[PDB]
């Protein structure tokens, strides 16, 4: 089967917990840690 997963564009691990997906960049995601460290902070993100 094809497993769908979201990998953080900062630590390159999978996103567990909150997912911070950029609203501007296509297909860019950060985990809660990388988000806290201020990566990609110049773009609005979707925190679901
Ligand atoms: Zn991360
Ligand atoms: Zn972006």
Author numbering: -3 to 44
Describing publication, verbatim:
Intriguingly, the autophagy adapter p62/SQSTM1/Sequestosome-1 was recently reported to recognize N-degrons, the N-end rule substrates of the well-characterized UPS, and where ultimately these substrates are delivered to ALS8,9. p62 is a key selective autophagy adapter that plays a role in the degradation of various cellular constituents such as misfolded proteins and their aggregates, malfunctioning organelles, and invading pathogens. Intriguingly, it was recently reported that the central ZZ-domain in p62 plays a critical role in the recognition of N-terminal arginylated BiP/GRP78 by the Arg-tRNA transferase ATE1. Here, we present the high resolution structures of the ZZ-domain of p62 in complex with 8 different N-degrons including type-1 and type-2, and subsequently identify key determinants involved in the unusual recognition.
However, a recent report has shown that the ZZ-domain of p62 also recognizes type-2 N-degrons, although with weaker affinity than with type-1 N-degrons. Therefore, we determined the structure of the ZZ-domain in complex with a variety of N-degrons comprising three type-1 N-degrons and five type-2 N-degrons. As described for the R-BiP complex, two aspartic acid residues, Asp129 and Asp149, bind to the α-amino group, and Asp147 forms a hydrogen bond with the first peptide bond, which means that these interactions are conserved in all different N-terminal residues. However, the side chain of the N-terminal residue of the N-degron is recognized differently. The side chain of Asn132 which undergoes a conformational change plays a critical role in interacting with the first residue of the N-degron. The bipolar nature of the side chain atoms (O and N) of Asn132 allow for the recognition of positively charged type-1 substrates as well as type-2 substrates, and especially N-terminal tyrosine and tryptophan residues since they possess polar atoms in the side chain. As expected, arginine at the primary position showed the strongest binding affinity with, intriguingly, tyrosine and tryptophan residues following in second and third place, respectively. Our structural and biochemical measurement data showed that the presence of tyrosine or tryptophan at the primary position resulted in relatively high affinity because these side chains contain polar atoms, oxygen in tyrosine and nitrogen in tryptophan that can form hydrogen bonds with the side chain of Asn132 of the ZZ-domain. Our structural information clearly explains the affinity measurement data as well as previous pull-down assay results showing that type-1 N-degrons and only a subset of type-2 N-degron peptides (Phe, Trp, and Tyr) displayed binding affinity with p62.
